[PDB]
Amino acid sequence: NQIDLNVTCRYAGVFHVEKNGRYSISRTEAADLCQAFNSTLPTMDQMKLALSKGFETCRYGFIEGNVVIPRIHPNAICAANHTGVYILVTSNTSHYDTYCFNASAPPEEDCTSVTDLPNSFDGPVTITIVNRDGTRYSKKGEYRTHQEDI
Template sequence: MASFYVWATFGLCLLKLCLTKTQFNVSCKYRGVFHVEKNGRYSLTRTEAADLCRALNSTLSTLEQLEKAHELGFETCRYGFVVGYIVIPRINPYHLCAANHTGIYKLSANTTGRYDAYCYNATETRDKACEPIERIDTSFLSNQGEIVIDNEDGSRYNADGTRHSGDK
């Protein structure tokens, strides 16, 4: 009987893993550059960050692209990958963000850590655009569960572009 409970518990754990939800939070775009996180803070490797940007019809931002976005007012309090660096774009000093620095604060090149991503969409030429991302190309992602895109404006979409009706 004890082995039944072990297998039942194991089966429920597997079921829970199969039903996991992957959430992507996406910021507004500044000259095509935007911040994206997966399942909360700092869960992406550099390779996963690049794949996620591709899934969002973008590439990993270069430092130069991020600098242009920063000049237009783009700032976060989140470390993220860009090509060759891990950065936080800061305009206003804040003691909990980038050690109170402003500008593009760079960490030493850490290839094994997990961070967020700064993506660049070359087709977005406006200074600031906050239209929601409604669809994600899942062929670039290694995900087994439900995908939900959370946009800065509060809208939520499933990977296929349909409105998500679940709780946030």
């Protein structure tokens, strides 16, 4: 197995994770993924603070309770011109990206490279953290605890 995890800069500890392809994480896998990063699925208030510090993406992703996109600037193809933490209301489907929250991060923007999946456990997968600047960190292990996700 090989799994690539593209991670963004953290904003008030909140970051975005894309696994392999766009929108391929379930809600259970997302919770396990954040846990592997010693993080949690963000609360809405945590996400709102991150947005205020400059966090935005053009990707739907899990937080605690909902699927959201943080938007600073209005774009027609990113939450249909909405700004703020846009909550996904209507979808047939169950697989998105995820957000995670790391309490130990700096309070503002942190674009240093993520170098580990610290809480990952023993397993057969090559897990590679890919940062936006291309710097990579790989380890062998596993983070999924539901067979359905494997």
